Design an enzyme around this catalytic site. Structure first.
Site, PDB file in Angstrom:
ATOM      1  N   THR A   1      25.463 -16.063  17.331  1.00 43.60           N
ATOM      2  CA  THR A   1      23.799 -16.162  16.676  1.00 43.60           C
ATOM      3  C   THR A   1      23.744 -17.508  16.264  1.00 43.60           C
ATOM      4  O   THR A   1      22.553 -17.661  15.486  1.00 43.60           O
ATOM      5  CB  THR A   1      23.800 -15.112  15.894  1.00 43.60           C
ATOM      6  OG1 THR A   1      24.375 -15.291  14.692  1.00 43.60           O
ATOM      7  CG2 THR A   1      24.028 -13.353  16.400  1.00 43.60           C
TER       8      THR A   1
ATOM      9  N   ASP B   1      28.869 -11.945  15.865  1.00 40.80           N
ATOM     10  CA  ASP B   1      29.219 -13.074  14.739  1.00 40.80           C
ATOM     11  C   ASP B   1      27.966 -14.006  14.200  1.00 40.80           C
ATOM     12  O   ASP B   1      27.053 -14.151  14.997  1.00 40.80           O
ATOM     13  CB  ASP B   1      30.131 -14.101  15.821  1.00 40.80           C
ATOM     14  CG  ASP B   1      30.657 -15.172  14.903  1.00 40.80           C
ATOM     15  OD1 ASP B   1      31.380 -14.742  14.109  1.00 40.80           O
ATOM     16  OD2 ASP B   1      30.051 -16.405  14.876  1.00 40.80           O
TER      17      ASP B   1
ATOM     18  N   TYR C   1      23.009 -19.862   9.375  1.00 46.39           N
ATOM     19  CA  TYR C   1      22.519 -19.477  10.584  1.00 46.39           C
ATOM     20  C   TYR C   1      20.956 -19.336  10.178  1.00 46.39           C
ATOM     21  O   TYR C   1      20.196 -19.249  11.387  1.00 46.39           O
ATOM     22  CB  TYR C   1      23.268 -18.588  11.562  1.00 46.39           C
ATOM     23  CG  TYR C   1      24.368 -18.852  12.176  1.00 46.39           C
ATOM     24  CD1 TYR C   1      25.085 -20.253  11.979  1.00 46.39           C
ATOM     25  CD2 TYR C   1      25.310 -18.089  12.702  1.00 46.39           C
ATOM     26  CE1 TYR C   1      26.274 -20.500  12.044  1.00 46.39           C
ATOM     27  CE2 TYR C   1      26.706 -18.279  13.157  1.00 46.39           C
ATOM     28  CZ  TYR C   1      27.015 -19.729  12.963  1.00 46.39           C
ATOM     29  OH  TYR C   1      28.351 -19.948  13.287  1.00 46.39           O
TER      30      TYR C   1
ATOM     31  N   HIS D   1      34.096 -20.657   6.018  1.00 43.51           N
ATOM     32  CA  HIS D   1      33.222 -21.281   7.323  1.00 43.51           C
ATOM     33  C   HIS D   1      34.058 -22.582   7.594  1.00 43.51           C
ATOM     34  O   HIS D   1      34.196 -22.913   8.825  1.00 43.51           O
ATOM     35  CB  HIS D   1      31.747 -21.651   6.919  1.00 43.51           C
ATOM     36  CG  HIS D   1      30.967 -21.392   8.121  1.00 43.51           C
ATOM     37  ND1 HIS D   1      29.715 -21.050   8.408  1.00 43.51           N
ATOM     38  CD2 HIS D   1      31.294 -22.087   9.482  1.00 43.51           C
ATOM     39  CE1 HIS D   1      29.255 -21.209   9.458  1.00 43.51           C
ATOM     40  NE2 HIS D   1      30.133 -22.152  10.327  1.00 43.51           N
TER      41      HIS D   1
ATOM     42  N   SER E   1      32.150 -21.616  20.314  1.00 42.84           N
ATOM     43  CA  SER E   1      31.589 -22.490  21.563  1.00 42.84           C
ATOM     44  C   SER E   1      32.600 -22.150  22.754  1.00 42.84           C
ATOM     45  O   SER E   1      33.061 -23.193  23.304  1.00 42.84           O
ATOM     46  CB  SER E   1      31.682 -23.992  21.211  1.00 42.84           C
ATOM     47  OG  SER E   1      31.006 -23.931  19.710  1.00 42.84           O
TER      48      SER E   1
ATOM     49  N   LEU F   1      31.769 -21.459  25.848  1.00 46.32           N
ATOM     50  CA  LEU F   1      31.205 -22.134  27.191  1.00 46.32           C
ATOM     51  C   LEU F   1      30.918 -23.791  26.772  1.00 46.32           C
ATOM     52  O   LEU F   1      30.333 -24.568  27.505  1.00 46.32           O
ATOM     53  CB  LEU F   1      29.721 -21.735  27.454  1.00 46.32           C
ATOM     54  CG  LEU F   1      29.876 -20.045  27.667  1.00 46.32           C
ATOM     55  CD1 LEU F   1      28.592 -19.564  27.875  1.00 46.32           C
ATOM     56  CD2 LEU F   1      30.663 -19.894  28.773  1.00 46.32           C
TER      57      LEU F   1
ATOM     58  N   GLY G   1      23.866 -25.830  25.271  1.00 44.20           N
ATOM     59  CA  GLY G   1      22.437 -25.987  24.623  1.00 44.20           C
ATOM     60  C   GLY G   1      22.477 -26.828  23.307  1.00 44.20           C
ATOM     61  O   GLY G   1      21.225 -26.927  22.731  1.00 44.20           O
TER      62      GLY G   1
ATOM     63  N   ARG H   1      22.244 -13.307  31.050  1.00 48.20           N
ATOM     64  CA  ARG H   1      23.346 -14.076  30.519  1.00 48.20           C
ATOM     65  C   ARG H   1      23.915 -13.069  29.556  1.00 48.20           C
ATOM     66  O   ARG H   1      25.465 -13.040  29.514  1.00 48.20           O
ATOM     67  CB  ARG H   1      23.070 -15.198  30.197  1.00 48.20           C
ATOM     68  CG  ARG H   1      22.419 -16.464  31.230  1.00 48.20           C
ATOM     69  CD  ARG H   1      22.221 -17.693  30.642  1.00 48.20           C
ATOM     70  NE  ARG H   1      21.310 -18.134  29.925  1.00 48.20           N
ATOM     71  CZ  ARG H   1      19.991 -17.732  30.395  1.00 48.20           C
ATOM     72  NH1 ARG H   1      19.541 -17.654  31.816  1.00 48.20           N
ATOM     73  NH2 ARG H   1      18.968 -18.180  29.595  1.00 48.20           N
TER      74      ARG H   1
HETATM   75  N1  LIG Z   1      31.874 -23.160  12.648  1.00 53.86           N
HETATM   76  C1  LIG Z   1      32.109 -22.033  13.240  1.00 53.86           C
HETATM   77  O1  LIG Z   1      32.876 -21.052  12.923  1.00 53.86           O
HETATM   78  C2  LIG Z   1      31.176 -22.007  14.386  1.00 53.86           C
HETATM   79  C3  LIG Z   1      30.999 -20.696  14.867  1.00 53.86           C
HETATM   80  N2  LIG Z   1      30.343 -20.611  16.182  1.00 53.86           N
HETATM   81  C4  LIG Z   1      29.987 -19.290  16.653  1.00 53.86           C
HETATM   82  O2  LIG Z   1      30.357 -19.157  18.046  1.00 53.86           O
HETATM   83  C5  LIG Z   1      29.212 -18.902  18.982  1.00 53.86           C
HETATM   84  C6  LIG Z   1      29.260 -19.335  20.273  1.00 53.86           C
HETATM   85  O3  LIG Z   1      29.289 -20.846  20.286  1.00 53.86           O
HETATM   86  P1  LIG Z   1      27.980 -21.611  20.505  1.00 53.86           P
HETATM   87  O4  LIG Z   1      28.242 -23.058  20.014  1.00 53.86           O
HETATM   88  O5  LIG Z   1      26.775 -20.874  20.049  1.00 53.86           O
HETATM   89  O6  LIG Z   1      27.708 -21.822  22.130  1.00 53.86           O
HETATM   90  P2  LIG Z   1      28.544 -21.182  23.442  1.00 53.86           P
HETATM   91  O7  LIG Z   1      29.626 -21.979  24.005  1.00 53.86           O
HETATM   92  O8  LIG Z   1      28.563 -19.685  23.045  1.00 53.86           O
HETATM   93  O9  LIG Z   1      27.118 -21.571  24.270  1.00 53.86           O
HETATM   94  C7  LIG Z   1      25.862 -21.074  24.346  1.00 53.86           C
HETATM   95  C8  LIG Z   1      24.990 -21.887  24.968  1.00 53.86           C
HETATM   96  O10 LIG Z   1      25.223 -21.414  26.528  1.00 53.86           O
HETATM   97  C9  LIG Z   1      24.132 -20.732  26.931  1.00 53.86           C
HETATM   98  N3  LIG Z   1      24.696 -19.653  27.818  1.00 53.86           N
HETATM   99  C10 LIG Z   1      25.088 -18.120  27.360  1.00 53.86           C
HETATM  100  N4  LIG Z   1      25.278 -17.572  28.462  1.00 53.86           N
HETATM  101  C11 LIG Z   1      25.449 -18.451  29.369  1.00 53.86           C
HETATM  102  C12 LIG Z   1      25.856 -17.986  30.893  1.00 53.86           C
HETATM  103  N5  LIG Z   1      26.368 -16.760  31.005  1.00 53.86           N
HETATM  104  N6  LIG Z   1      25.906 -19.064  31.542  1.00 53.86           N
HETATM  105  C13 LIG Z   1      25.227 -19.971  31.372  1.00 53.86           C
HETATM  106  N7  LIG Z   1      24.880 -20.618  30.001  1.00 53.86           N
HETATM  107  C14 LIG Z   1      25.057 -19.452  29.107  1.00 53.86           C
HETATM  108  C15 LIG Z   1      23.146 -20.466  25.916  1.00 53.86           C
HETATM  109  O11 LIG Z   1      21.985 -20.157  26.471  1.00 53.86           O
HETATM  110  P3  LIG Z   1      20.774 -19.010  26.365  1.00 53.86           P
HETATM  111  O12 LIG Z   1      20.953 -18.443  24.750  1.00 53.86           O
HETATM  112  O13 LIG Z   1      19.545 -19.347  26.850  1.00 53.86           O
HETATM  113  O14 LIG Z   1      21.501 -17.933  27.115  1.00 53.86           O
HETATM  114  C16 LIG Z   1      23.210 -21.562  24.788  1.00 53.86           C
HETATM  115  O15 LIG Z   1      22.534 -22.531  25.310  1.00 53.86           O
HETATM  116  C17 LIG Z   1      27.999 -19.527  17.910  1.00 53.86           C
HETATM  117  O16 LIG Z   1      26.902 -19.081  18.317  1.00 53.86           O
HETATM  118  C18 LIG Z   1      28.498 -19.092  16.691  1.00 53.86           C
HETATM  119  O17 LIG Z   1      28.553 -17.256  16.382  1.00 53.86           O
HETATM  120  C19 LIG Z   1      29.950 -21.790  16.815  1.00 53.86           C
HETATM  121  C20 LIG Z   1      30.091 -22.867  16.530  1.00 53.86           C
HETATM  122  C21 LIG Z   1      30.623 -23.291  15.162  1.00 53.86           C
END
Ligand SMILES: NC(=O)C1=CN([C@@H]2O[C@H](COP(=O)(O)OP(=O)(O)OC[C@H]3O[C@@H](n4cnc5c(N)ncnc54)[C@H](OP(=O)(O)O)[C@@H]3O)[C@@H](O)[C@H]2O)C=CC1
Length: 308
Positions: free
Chosen positions: A19, A43, A48, A110, A202, A204, A208, A257
């Protein structure tokens, strides 16, 4: 393979909805769609700024009878400014207030990084971490059952190792950047050797995020295996993590997605195609620039990550 077992005994669903960057106005319908579609893991984090709106989505799902509280695994994170041992329980309480929950399934430190309470990430506000005293307070949350599992995020093998040596309750999870582009083999190993679960943020490569140079879904090896196996590139990336015994936290606000990212259970990546992953150039996308500084404990990238 729809879950892993933490060192607490609790099952963590192997796919959760990320999220980060899910705006307060869209996140509610995204959580709703995700759970309806079978997700049992959300998550979250204080920082956030969307926990109030996730809470409204959960309370909708419960009152609508889609799930009960016990079916769901809810994670949140203690922000850098609430590391002081006396501030930790207020932080958890703030997140339980917003989520409208009695407990979290997982509460994470975090970052291995601290600033003065109520201040911004700016060098004047930097305070030396005391991870043992923060972990000490996190244990009290675990004792009371307010956080059913406790763990860390962005800890290297070294920092994870140093906490395990002094912990009464061992970290249950180390949430870290992990994907085909950044495979974290060392920490993956250290985690299985210690019984700590590696949870992949992350997964993927966060495509974005304009300030991250993610192009994991564009890698020739992932595009290939997707085409070979009749799956999307995302599907492959996520499946790779699940076959490594890591949970994945794919973020989406797009119902289709969201559905596709849960579709990683009924099919496999052959050992041949699993061999093709060390043919993938390795680069950490989320470097922790924001806390590598002359007045930081982490004067260098290598100091934050312990060479990793
Ligand atoms: N410090 C920490 O502990 C961190 C924790 N996190 C956690 O991990 C999560 C996931 O990592 P995050 O950095 O958000 O990025 P991700 O690797 O989860 O990728 C998210 C991006 O990919 C797009 N996407 C989603 N599904 C698909 C699909 N099937 N095909 C193509 N594109 C897709 C989304 O667009 P759309 O929404 O338009 O589908 C968005 O732009 C975070 O959101 C958070 O909850 C991440 C970063 C740091």
């Amino acid at each position: 393979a729809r879950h892993f077992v933490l060192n607490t005994g609790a099952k963590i669903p192997s796919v959760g909805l990320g999220t980060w960057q899910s705006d307060p106005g869209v996140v509610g319908d995204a959580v709703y769609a995700a759970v309806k579609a079978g997700y049992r893991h959300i998550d979250c984090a204080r920082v956030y700024g969307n926990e109030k709106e996730i809470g409204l989505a959960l309370k909708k799902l419960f009152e609508e009878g889609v799930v009960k509280r016990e079916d769901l695994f809810i994670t949140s994170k203690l922000w850098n400014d609430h590391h002081a041992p006396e501030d930790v329980p207020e932080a958890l309480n703030e997140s339980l207030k917003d989520l409208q929950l009695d407990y979290l399934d997982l509460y994470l430190i975090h970052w291995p990084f601290r600033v003065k309470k109520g201040t911004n990430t700016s060098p004047e506000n930097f305070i030396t971490p005391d991870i043992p005293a923060t972990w000490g307070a996190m244990e009290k949350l675990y004792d009371a059952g307010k956080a059913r599992a406790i763990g860390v995020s962005n800890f290297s093998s070294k920092k994870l190792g140093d906490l395990l040596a002094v912990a009464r309750v061992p970290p249950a999870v180390d949430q870290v950047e992990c994907h085909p582009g950044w495979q974290q083999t060392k920490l993956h190993n250290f985690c299985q050797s210690t019984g700590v679960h590696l949870s992949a943020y992350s997964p993927l490569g966060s495509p974005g995020t304009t300030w991250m140079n993610g192009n994991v879904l564009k890698e020739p090896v992932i595009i290939s295996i997707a085409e070979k196996l009749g799956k999307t590139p995302a599907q492959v990336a996520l499946r790779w993590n699940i076959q490594m015994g890591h949970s994945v936290l794919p973020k989406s606000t797009n119902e289709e997605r969201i559905k596709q990212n849960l579709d990683v259970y009924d099919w496999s990546i052959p050992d041949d195609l699993l061999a093709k992953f060390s043919e993938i150039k390795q680069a950490r996308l989320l470097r922790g620039n924001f806390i590598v500084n002359p007045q930081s404990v982490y004067k260098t990238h290598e100091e934050l990550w312990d060479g990793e």
